[PDB]
Amino acid sequence: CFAKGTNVLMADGSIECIENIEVGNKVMGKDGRPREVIKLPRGRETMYSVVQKSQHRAHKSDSSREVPELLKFTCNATHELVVRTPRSVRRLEVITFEMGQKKAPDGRIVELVKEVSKSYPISEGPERANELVESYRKASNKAYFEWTIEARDLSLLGSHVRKATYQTYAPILYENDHFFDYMQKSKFHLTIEGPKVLAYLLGLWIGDGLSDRATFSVDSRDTSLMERVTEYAEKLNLCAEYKDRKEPQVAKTVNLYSKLNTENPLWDAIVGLGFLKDGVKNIPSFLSTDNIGTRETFLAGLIDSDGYVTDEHGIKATIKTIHTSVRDGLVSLARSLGLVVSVNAEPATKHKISYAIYMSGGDVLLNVLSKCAGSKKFRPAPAAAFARECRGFYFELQELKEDDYYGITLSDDSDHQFLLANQVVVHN
Amino acid sequence: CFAKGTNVLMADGSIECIENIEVGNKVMGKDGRPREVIKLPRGRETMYSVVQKSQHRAHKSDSSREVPELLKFTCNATHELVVRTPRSVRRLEVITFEMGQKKAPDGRIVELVKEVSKSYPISEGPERANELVESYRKASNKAYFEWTIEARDLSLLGSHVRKATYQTYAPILYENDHFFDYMQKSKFHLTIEGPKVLAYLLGLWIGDGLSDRATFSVDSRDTSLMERVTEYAEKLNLCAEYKDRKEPQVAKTVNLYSKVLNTENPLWDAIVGLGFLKDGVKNIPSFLSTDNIGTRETFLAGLIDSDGYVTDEHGIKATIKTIHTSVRDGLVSLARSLGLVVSVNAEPATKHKISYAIYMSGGDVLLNVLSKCAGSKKFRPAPAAAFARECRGFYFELQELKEDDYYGITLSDDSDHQFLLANQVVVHN
């Protein structure tokens, strides 16, 4: 039901092209648990591509710097989109969104959400109206409809319903212990200290450190940070040497020697784990399926050196970077936690393009900021427990036709949905 | 008990200087209900200025071009601030925000919110650890504390708690009906749909209308918005004439002529009559903020449909751009009166040295405005159910000031002892 090349998420965090998946294989379920592939449907059908609706767009040339907003895929016409639409009722001419049906041009009857209206004489008194809205309100335990519509049928939706309809991506709940295992692979388990502490400092590294030694800036900005870098460095048996600034009276130098900066455990980790790529900084892919607390700590560290926290219309954290490797790696990482992300190519020693990355998520973001030590960056942890939920995204569908499609069908015993490599929740 | 000149919101939506209030007058309560004044505390005391934390401040006997910070007031040292603090538990050594106590420099023991740590033994298991936490999580239905603290005791707060603590403003639930009354008392127009279509039309005009007649812009690419304008201008007994280009090919000019652009038409008369064109300059009249809610909402939908944009990105949000200082100020107050979160940002462009971008958010509160829009990318369905227009918080800076006279009011023995300042901030007598 997908085009050749479509990357899907395997039950182990590995990415795999739809066409190379075999019977017996296990893909990733929205719950972080596996889904077994039992058959591999193949055929030819008109295809449709799904692309997230943007605002600030241009990407479609490999001339570089065109943000590759991961959320998109191509599927065949009969492939079922996993969609949601909010419930809605207006007045008390009470208008509501309700599941209904419509005959398609080819004769088929399709079940779909429809804009419905009921109106009676003002003369007849508001009795019937209030029973309508109250009734509508009792009709469900959710503030949205969760359902599916084959790609070819989306055009049947009326405008209001179509625009309000969105697909979703799921946080990656599955967790690996690669950070842990890399730590074991350099002497290990004897005495406290773990991956969150290293992840934090590595976060600081990407944020504003030097790409040639285990050394980064600090100075002040949030000041309280310093006591933590020493305490954390200390936890990793390293040592933090502070020097004479490293930015017009705003940043410093902190060398993390082995209780150096080269033949060191940290820069080993840096270039060893993948944080330094082609002479440029980058946040690794394993991160996205690692331990959640580790992911949050790496992020807390990154927010601490080069992040901007805001409260105005909800918490939001912003990171600017020129490296596309960092950009792409951060969007993946944040999304795996269940945060909402949007990048923005904007203006900018002298250099061309700069990337602004904003993350939101309420309690999900509060869980990250609570791990920060920077004065204007820390925000109290959530009040209560919280579920990392699927986030929605509005999209545009495009008819393409032609082509061969590749599908995998999961067991009937299961909830026939799994995750593409971009975290989008898809059906068979 | 505040500084002289502090404007209080009266029970009828009117406004009065605190030194002018008298025993028996009724101020506005946060539920839209009155609160009677029973006493008038006067005195001289050290004063404290409360101002919202923003990049703004603006006018004090000068120009209006800078965006001012309107959320503020000057109270005395002992005045109790109505504040909120979120609840929070961290790690699973556990840290929580809790109601506690502290002793002031004088004798006084003041109950305040405190950050608290809990840690101890190894191997015992997920008992106490995941316990302290789960407990904390069930501890309340509310995700915040609601308490008061005198201005002078604010500095007793820890750093985390202090920065996390904020004040609140309440929507204006109270509704006059000066708009409907204008219409009924005036010109020529049967209602039922009347105040809705008019307010909407006045929204489009404020957004991009000519300052001397009933003409405005409308996106040409938008069929349903053009339909809407026709449909509503018709309900008002007006005839809408579209003209190719009211902006280099993007918008069409719309002329609103009376049926059978200044004289003998409902739109221009209401513009002049209700104060939207205050002596040559556009304005969003104050009455609007204490008027019928549906009307305030429709008017906003009109503005949004005219010179605004909606984004879903990180939460539903609407932005309205205006080059007019008066529209800017009236808009901030109108939006807050509904319970929307609002922020203004000064921006760039013969040309205009500066324009103002005003951002609005507030989940269902905003969705109720948007569902009245006809613009293709503006409209968003009405809420899924009934919602509450809750108070909105704001972080603030407190500064100890001069000793000066103070004017306070005392509300009924046993009542919530809370009322609204003219800027909607929730105050304790």
- Are A35 and A105 in a shared domain? yes
Give the domain range for residue A318: 284-372
The domain boundary, picked from A233, A256, A283, lies at: A283
The secondary structure of residue B371, as a DSSP letter, is T
Number of domains comprising chain B = 3
Report CB contact under 8 Å: B341, A379: no
- Are A413 and A341 in a shared domain? no
Radius of gyration of chain A (CA): 25
Pick A381's closest partner by Cβ from B90, B140, B383.
B90
User: Using CA atoms, how far apart are residues A384 and B275, in angstroms rounded to an integer?
Assistant: 49
With respect to residue A384, please indicate whether it lies within any of the assigned structural domains.
Answer: no
Report CB contact under 8 Å: B384, A144: yes
With respect to residue B428, please indicate whether it lies within any of the assigned structural domains.
Answer: yes
Pick A384's closest partner by Cβ from B143, B224, B361.
B143
With respect to residue A381, please indicate whether it lies within any of the assigned structural domains.
Answer: no
Report CB contact under 8 Å: B164, A379: yes
Q: Is the dihedral of CA B110, B113, B119, B125 positive or negative?
A: positive
All residues at 6 or more sequence positions from A135 whose CB lies less than 8 Å from its CB, including other chains: none
- In Å, how far are A37, A282, A392, B404 from A271, measured between CA atoms? 36, 10, 35, 64
Q: Which of residues 318-357 of A touch B (CB under 8 A)?
A: 340, 342
With respect to residue B379, please indicate whether it lies within any of the assigned structural domains.
Answer: no
With respect to residue B232, please indicate whether it lies within any of the assigned structural domains.
Answer: yes
Q: Which of residues 306-325 of B touch A (CB under 8 A)?
A: 311-315, 317
Nearest CA in chain B to A144: B384
- Are A136 and A44 in a shared domain? yes
With respect to residue A383, please indicate whether it lies within any of the assigned structural domains.
Answer: no
H helix intervals, B308-385: 325-337, 364-370
Q: Resolution (in Å) of the shown entry?
A: 2.4
Q: Gap positions in chain A, given as the residue before each gap (C–N > 2.5 A)? A: 92, 259, 348
Given CB atoms, is A279 within the 8 Å cutoff of chain B?
no
The domain boundary, picked from B217, B249, B284, lies at: B284
Torsions phi, psi for B159 (to 5 deg): -70, -45
Q: What are the residue numbers of the active site of B?
A: 1, 76, 78-79, 282, 378, 408-409, 429
User: Using CA atoms, how far apart are residues B358 and B322, in angstroms rounded to an integer?
Assistant: 8
Report the candidate in B172, B160, B4, B156 with the shortest Cα–Cα distance to residue B81.
B156
All residues at 6 or more sequence positions from A254 whose CB lies less than 8 Å from its CB, including other chains: A215, A216, A217, A218, A226, A229, A240, A241, A242, A243
Report CB contact under 8 Å: B313, A370: no
Instruction: Encode burial over B270-305: b for 16+ CB neighbours within 10 A, e otherwise.
Output: bbeebbbbeeeebbbbbebbbbbbebbbbbbbbbbb
All residues at 6 or more sequence positions from B278 whose CB lies less than 8 Å from its CB, including other chains: B285, B326
Instruction: Starting at the earlier edge strand, list the strands of the sheet with B80-86.
Output: B144-150, B80-86, B166-169, B392-394
Q: Which of the residues A57, A84, A88 would you substitute to probe the B interface, choosing the one with the greatest number of B C-beta atoms within 10 Å?
A: A88
With respect to residue A385, please indicate whether it lies within any of the assigned structural domains.
Answer: no
- Are A74 and A208 in a shared domain? no
Q: Is residue A35 classed as helix, strand or coil in its secondary structure? A: strand
- Are A128 and A202 in a shared domain? no
User: Using CA atoms, how far apart are residues B186 and B176, in angstroms rounded to an integer?
Assistant: 17
- Are B274 and B309 in a shared domain? no
- Are A116 and A63 in a shared domain? yes
Residue A232 is part of a domain; what is its CATH number? Answer: 3.10.28.10
Contacts of B383 in chain A (CB under 8 A): 88-89
Residue A99 is part of a domain; what is its CATH number? Answer: 2.170.16.10
What are the structure tokens assigned to A412, written together?
């009937």
Report the candidate in B294, B80, B275, B51 with the shortest Cα–Cα distance to residue B180.
B294
The secondary structure of residue B41, as a DSSP letter, is -
Contacts of A313 in chain B (CB under 8 A): 314-315, 317, 341, 343, 359, 361
- Are A49 and A165 in a shared domain? yes
Q: Is residue A398 classed as helix, strand or coil in its secondary structure? A: strand
Torsions phi, psi for B254 (to 5 deg): -125, 125
Report CB contact under 8 Å: A97, B381: yes
What are the structure tokens assigned to B197, written together?
């279509």
- Are A266 and A338 in a shared domain? no
- Are A156 and A183 in a shared domain? no
- For residue B35, the cross-strand partners are B27
Given CB atoms, is B160 within the 8 Å cutoff of chain A?
yes
Given CB atoms, is A72 within the 8 Å cutoff of chain B?
no
Report CB contact under 8 Å: A89, B371: no
Q: Which of residues 357-396 of A touch B (CB under 8 A)?
A: 358, 360, 370, 378-385, 394
The domain boundary, picked from B284, B311, B343, lies at: B284
User: Using CA atoms, how far apart are residues B4 and A252, in angstroms rounded to an integer?
Assistant: 48
- Are A311 and A163 in a shared domain? no
Given CB atoms, is B184 within the 8 Å cutoff of chain A?
no
- Are B7 and B153 in a shared domain? yes
Tracing tokens 């503005």 back to the chain, one arrives at B303
Distance to chain B for A83, nearest Cα, Å: 17
With respect to residue A329, please indicate whether it lies within any of the assigned structural domains.
Answer: yes
Torsions phi, psi for A25 (to 5 deg): -50, 160
